[PDB]
Amino acid sequence: RFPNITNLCPFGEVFNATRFASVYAWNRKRISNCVADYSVLYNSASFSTFKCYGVSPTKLNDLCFTNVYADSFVIRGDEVRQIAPGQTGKIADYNYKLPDDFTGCVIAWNSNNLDSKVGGNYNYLYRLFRKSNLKPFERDISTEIYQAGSTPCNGVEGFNCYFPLQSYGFQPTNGVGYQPYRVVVLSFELLHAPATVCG
């Protein structure tokens, strides 16, 4: 009848962040040993997509989790669908892929107010092609030039010689499909260890 743990999960430190990471270099924050209130996140109510897998989001608040990881990145509006288990797309195949047995949540909200500027922001990149598909939660930030050509590239972008990463270029005048969206993916395991507490 008396509470032990006094630690708030630092969701603010992951959401009120100055600049999110590029989708090819998605940032991950280890969450542990803290209480979290998901009612405040859903009540913020600005998110365009707040969908959870393995557990209904409405009844998420009264469960105890372990190995909670928050992955943050920025993608295109039309690319939101790709952040889901088993989806095939430009991003999911080569940038960030949820596994088929996914257990976490996906949060996505429009960032056209901050992450685009007149003339465009080209600081958010995506990996166009990769030699092999990415494994779940695999993080590959390599910048090795494809040199399918006579001469060796020697680390110079050019012709017969292509660079993997492509700039997004969000302008505030873009279509909603091309507008930038900030995404946070929560990976966790459902824990039922104390029968009374987590039953």
Binding site: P3, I5, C34, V197
Partner: peptide
């Protein structure tokens, strides 16, 4: 309860 597991708010009340 156990330090090192992320409790939800209502489950932290039950704690």
């Amino acid at each position: 309860x156990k330090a090192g597991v992320v409790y939800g708010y209502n489950a932290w009340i039950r704690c």
